[PDB]
Amino acid sequence: EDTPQFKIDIDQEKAQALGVSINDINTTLGAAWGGSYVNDFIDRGRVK
Amino acid sequence: STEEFGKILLKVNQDGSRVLLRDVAKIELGGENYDIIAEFNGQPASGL
Amino acid sequence: GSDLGKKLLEAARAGRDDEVRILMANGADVNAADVVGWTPLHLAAYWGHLEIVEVLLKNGADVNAYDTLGSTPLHLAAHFGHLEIVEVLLKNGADVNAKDDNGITPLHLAANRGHLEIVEVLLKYGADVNAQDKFGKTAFDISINNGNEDLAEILQ
Numbered sequence: 740e741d742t743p744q745f746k747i748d749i750d751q752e753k754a755q756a757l758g759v760s761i762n763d764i765n766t767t768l769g770a771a772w773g774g775s776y777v778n779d780f781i782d783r784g785r786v787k
Numbered sequence: 788s789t790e791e792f793g794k795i796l797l798k799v800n801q802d803g804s805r806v807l808l809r810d811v812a813k814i815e816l817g818g819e820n821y822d823i824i825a826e827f828n829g830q831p832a833s834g835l
Numbered sequence: 836g837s838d839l840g841k842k843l844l845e846a847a848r849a850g851r852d853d854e855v856r857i858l859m860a861n862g863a864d865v866n867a868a869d870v871v872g873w874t875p876l877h878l879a880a881y882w883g884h885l886e887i888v889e890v891l892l893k894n895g896a897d898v899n900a901y902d903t904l905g906s907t908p909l910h911l912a913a914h915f916g917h918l919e920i921v922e923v924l925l926k927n928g929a930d931v932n933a934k935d936d937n938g939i940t941p942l943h944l945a946a947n948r949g950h951l952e953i954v955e956v957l958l959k960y961g962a963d964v965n966a967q968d969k970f971g972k973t974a975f976d977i978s979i980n981n982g983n984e985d986l987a988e989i990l991q
């Protein structure tokens with residue numbers, strides 16, 4: 740069934756007025772709240 | 788919708804007036820391409 | 836939150852008029868709220884269930900109940916184009932100039948979705964046409980940005 744969800748609207752005019760890129764806004768929100776797969780490291784001979 | 792693409796904010800001028808995408812372009816629901824035009828017994832048609 | 840409170844939230848949402856009737860008779864909490872602060876009236880207003888909006892207000896539902904972000908049933912009804920529910924809420928004393936945490940009013944929301952009939956009703960019950968949100972935007976600013984010619988002419 741449909742469930743409550745948190746709609747957030749980015750004001751494009753306010754972002755442009757303060758000199759804040761939408762990429763930086765969407766990355767900050769996504770990375771922090773959603774998580775972001777950056778790249779791989781090698782843990783005891785295994786790529787992770 | 789065309790209306791939503793129309794109100795895309797390209798920039799805000801020095802005096803605070805907004806330049807929207809509809810101010811620099813006509814926005815319509817049109818074909819991916821305009822190469823193929825089909826008629827069936829003279830009248831407008833599409834087909835597979 | 837009670838057993839019947841949860842049952843009423845689900846029934847108000849689903850539009851099950853006959854089940855709401857039975858729950859009103861057994862004294863199901865009309866001020867019952869879920870985790871986001873939505874009452875049965877909020878839910879009925881959102882999903883557009885007129886009969887249940889009327890029944891809940893008869894049974895002493897808070898017409899100006901607000902969720903955890905300051906949104907009222909009139910906000911929801913105005914935003915989703917439910918004209919009849921907007922009229923009923925306003926007749927039962929809904930704050931026509933109710934501001935959520937963003938400074939957004941029923942007039943702002945109705946203007947945004949181009950609900951002309953609802954805008955006229957809100958203005959008739961004395962909606963503040965000069966009311967600004969957190970970005971200093973009026974219902975008129977929304978009408979010209981959306982390019983709504985009819986709406987822009989009414990918000991003169």
Ligand code: NA
Nearest residue numbers: 761762765766
């Ligand atoms: Na982006």
